[PDB]
Write a protein that binds this ligand. Structure first.
Ligand SMILES: N[C@@H](CCC(=O)N[C@@H](CS)C(=O)NCC(=O)O)C(=O)O
Lengths: 598, 598
């Protein structure tokens, strides 16, 4: 577990904290001596009431202060150092988890709830500032000080005292915890009712019409008042239990202290103890009560943080499935790449075979389209080319070589993707376009936004390039979004290009515009382009069309040749698809007639 | 004016805490006397060291305990009593806020963001338990004790002491706040960056594919590390400045205390002051340090909670626009209700009129339907009849009386609504059906669930009637929901009945089933039914059809007679509606073909 330190001088700082820790408590126990000695050093003659104060004691009362102040300053300095340790561990862990997170496989990321992960990794770091704080700011200081104090008690007043001091500390613990763990049975009940009343008031605000259309209002009001009164009663039991907790804690010390001052007064009669000795055993034992109040909030905290920190550790336990083998190839530099599928059988889970023994070629320089109705399996080409997944049977070759043997990072570099639904980042657009390639000159970025015909957006946008998009920002049209994606893939300048269903922008008028801006930028310039559509009309000018059916390659040719082929599937698809376009275009037209008055 | 006093004898409870407060600092200040007395009364002979302890002082050390414990015990009790005051005010405010909110008009409820209201009142109560605690648990107790201690000092030790005690108090405050206000610019910066890292890591996990489809990864890891180091470097400055604060605060009391032991020891030379008196001025002035360390978390809270208490109060400021006049009519008793529109002009925002000078009669007992294409203004009939809004020009009468003169509750009680989208409540269905009329017998609720043909749903449902429906529960189909809304209006048994676009259940077979269930329960039984439809096909059996266009009543008659009327608008609407239904029926057929892998 743990092990934030390995080979460095951060442990230098760690010793320093401990020195400042030890040396802050020494200065603390030293304070009451200076109070006792100063008391005794005044229990004398003074029949000349005009004498100045002996410096011999003037010094001793400075000592009091510069030991009182000394104790705190070294405790603060202990803290300020160790934070430079703590904040360092969190920064280092939060990154290595993130970094290892993306080295993880796609199948993994898809099962995992992204929020279950964002919490797990955040609440993972909280559980470190919870557990390193528990030790260094509380337990170790309270361990040393209690050790030292009972030590001195044995030594200077007798184990008679030390016995009851340490005993009281233990009684304090095994009352604080046995009460505190008990008293969560209220907060977990208070914020319960708080939520009950929270939900009643919310329905009553959303469904405002619904309560209006009926009687009620009063029904929901004293339904609220019901939940409100449950919560009042519950919070009342919290404030009350707290009183009991604080009174029980004080009664422990007050008697512990009171009974000792008795014990001290016998030693003043027995002549063994001075009068300062009374102040000493009082103020000595009292100085332990202060930090003892904190270490009662914890216990559960230490329980919850023990696991919440492991769950964050457990993440990096996860194994990487898709890795490049030993002696991995980079390979070809300046040739156009072709793609071939040899008997590829693949799906997610052996129950679902999606690609059933698929074989075909995607030649270099060409525009190849891959079409098929619902269930075809075109839906999984790119993912296999990008080795996101690996095929269960059969293999996939680029330029005669299996891509398994290629360097998995090298491969992915030459492939550009315009995805069906583009992601935006909570950032500037100018930072979203630049996402294509980081080292882009400002000039490159403008041209690419120009080439894509994204200009009208930034002009229409008041805050221009600096406008914030993302879920937490300004939302833009699908068209402007897909336009941005074209922009990105222009910057990346890949050799192989995928357009995975690029134009399911649910507006035909907008699809037209996008398909043109694409036919301008990606025309046969020794880029090998794969188009994956289900609207064949948008890929009719392809150099090769591969049509899949229930996971297997049925036909394979050009548009005009596939259409003319007797008994072709393409013609069935072209026909329904086209009959459909006329229909939903015709239906849109009539919705319009009914859309406005007459 | 949080008004802890009003008209009840809860102000008796209020005094007790204050009493418990007053009698708790007294028990506190006496503790150094009993410690002093015990010191002086032991500074004597004892030349017989076998004597038992004199009771005169055994009592003096008892007095110490039962004053130390008593002081706290009264402070705990002051708090547990006063919670029973605080918690009560929140409840009282939480209800009248809730109650008055529903007296507000639909337009108000529609503009205000509903979560903003839920935050406002949740954050509203925080600012009361914060300002009631700040007063009774801190400011007053520490003001009272400072006075008492400064009283004692001037009285028994001279203004010499009081001068520097009180000065230390001010020096303490007007440093802490002046420091704390400075040091907030770090937590407001740490959690700033923490949110930056938050969004980075989140974006890199949702758009995990995008970062994979591109270069980057490394780009995003050290975009995180930037924020991570922004946060680390920020969090240290939090710990560093905190150390300064606690050190700076400790310096203040340490010199103040030390300097007084000087000033005290000189009064021991002058024979004026005993040695216990050294303990006395120390511990008295020390016992003022304890609660002062908390009272530094405030000042800003006192500001933030002051406005968060004011915005929550600003709510009841809001004017109720739709209110009944003085001496409002209830009226007609056992007659069927009719509805008539006299020159009604209405819109939201006076510039954009929806209903333009509409006049028509909705005769009693009949089934009246109101149809029209978009812009018609049928879209706003119900809202006006329910006095949600009031017409700009013209009036609306039920049985000859302007509905403005009716008791707005009396009016709304006789109108039942089956809305286009029924709302669900987070509760059982049985409680959602019973919502129609609360005082319904359990049997009544059964007959209604039967009549509505809702029975099949509760049988199909796992936990039967007790099943939890709602957003944070189990969602049911539109058809089942509209089936439940029909149920509710049966329990209500209203005299006037509106079916606002009830069956735009985007599933036709389910529409047909519903219309049958409606036509069975609502047959002219001295109930006057108004249907607002846009598929005229569903209201052809009406007794009167009123057709609106661009806000004005164009034609008005029966189904067959309107159809036959030459140049009628109804035949035009009938025609578009007919073709439209025919198209989307054909389009349903064609999508199915492409929907399957054959
Ligand atoms: N001396 C106090 C510090 C009081 C204080 O201002 N604490 C900060 C920590 S930086 C805080 O967040 N207080 C609550 C707030 O101001 O919202 C303590 O350490 O217990």
């Amino acid at each position: 577990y743990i092990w934030p330190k390995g080979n460095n001088k951060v442990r230098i700082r760690v010793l320093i904290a401990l020195g400042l820790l030890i040396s802050a408590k020494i200065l603390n126990v030293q304070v009451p001596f200076f109070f006792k000695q100063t008391i005794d050093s005044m229990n004398i003659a003074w029949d000349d009431p005009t004498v100045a104060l002996p410096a011999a004691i003037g010094l001793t009362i400075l000592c009091y202060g510069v030991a009182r102040f000394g104790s705190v300053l070294f405790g603060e300095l202990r803290n300020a150092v160790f934070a430079k340790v703590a904040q360092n561990a969190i920064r280092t862990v939060s990154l290595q988890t993130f970094q290892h997170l993306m080295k993880l496989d796609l199948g993994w990321h898809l099962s995992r709830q992204t929020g279950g992960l964002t919490r797990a990794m955040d609440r993972g770091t909280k559980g470190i500032s919870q557990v390193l704080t528990a030790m260094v700011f509380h337990i170790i200081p309270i361990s040393f000080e209690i050790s030292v104090v009972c030590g001195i008690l044995t030594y200077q007043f007798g184990a008679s005292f030390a016995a009851i001091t340490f005993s009281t500390m233990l009684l304090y613990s095994i009352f604080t915890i046995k009460t505190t763990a008990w008293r969560t049975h209220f907060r977990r009940d208070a914020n319960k009712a708080d939520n009950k009343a929270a939900s009643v008031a919310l329905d009553s605000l959303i469904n405002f019409e619904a309560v209006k259309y009926f009687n009620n209002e009063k029904y929901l009001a004293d339904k609220y008042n019901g939940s409100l009164m449950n919560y009042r009663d519950s919070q009342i039991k919290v404030s009350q239990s707290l009183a009991f907790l604080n009174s029980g804690q004080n009664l422990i010390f007050t008697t512990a202290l009171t009974a000792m001052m008795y014990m001290g007064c016998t030693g003043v009669i027995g002549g063994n103890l001075t009068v300062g000795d009374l102040v000493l055993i009082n103020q000595l034992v009292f100085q332990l009560s202060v930090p003892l109040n904190f270490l009662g909030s914890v216990y559960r905290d230490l329980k919850q943080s023990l696991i919440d920190m492991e769950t964050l550790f457990k993440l990096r336990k996860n194994e990487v499935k898709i890795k490049n083998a030993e002696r991995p190839l980079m390979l070809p530099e300046n040739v156009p790449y072709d793609i071939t599928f040899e008997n590829v059988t693949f799906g997610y889970h052996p129950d679902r075979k999606i690609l059933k023994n698929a074989s075909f070629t995607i030649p270099a320089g060409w525009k190849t389209a891959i079409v098929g109705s619902s269930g075809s399996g075109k839906s999984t080409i790119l993912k296999l080319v990008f080795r996101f997944y690996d095929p269960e049977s059969g293999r996939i070759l680029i330029n005669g070589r299996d891509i398994k043997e290629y360097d998995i990072d090298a491969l992915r570099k030459v492939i550009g993707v315009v995805p069906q639904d583009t992601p935006l980042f909570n950032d500037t657009i100018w930072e979203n376009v630049k996402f294509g390639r980081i080292d882009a000159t400002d000039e490159e970025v403008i041209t690419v936004v120009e080439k894509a015909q994204l200009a009208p957006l930034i002009k229409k946008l008041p805050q221009g390039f600096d406008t914030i998009v993302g879920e937490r920002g300004l939302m833009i049209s699908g068209g402007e979004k897909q336009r941005l994606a074209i922009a990105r893939v222009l910057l990346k300048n890949a050799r192989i290009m995928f357009f995975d269903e690029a134009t399911s922008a649910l507006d035909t008028h907008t699809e037209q515009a996008l398909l043109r801006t694409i036919r301008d930028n990606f025309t046969s310039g020794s880029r090998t382009s794969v188009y994956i559509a289900h609207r064949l009309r948008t890929i009719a000018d392809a150099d090769k069309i591969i049509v899949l059916d229930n996971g297997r390659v049925r036909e394979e040719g050009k548009h005009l040749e596939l259409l003319a082929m007797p008994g072709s599937l393409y013609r069935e698809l072209w026909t329904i698809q086209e009959d459909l376009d006329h229909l939903e275009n015709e239906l849109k037209d009539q919705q319009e007639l009914w859309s406005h008055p007459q």
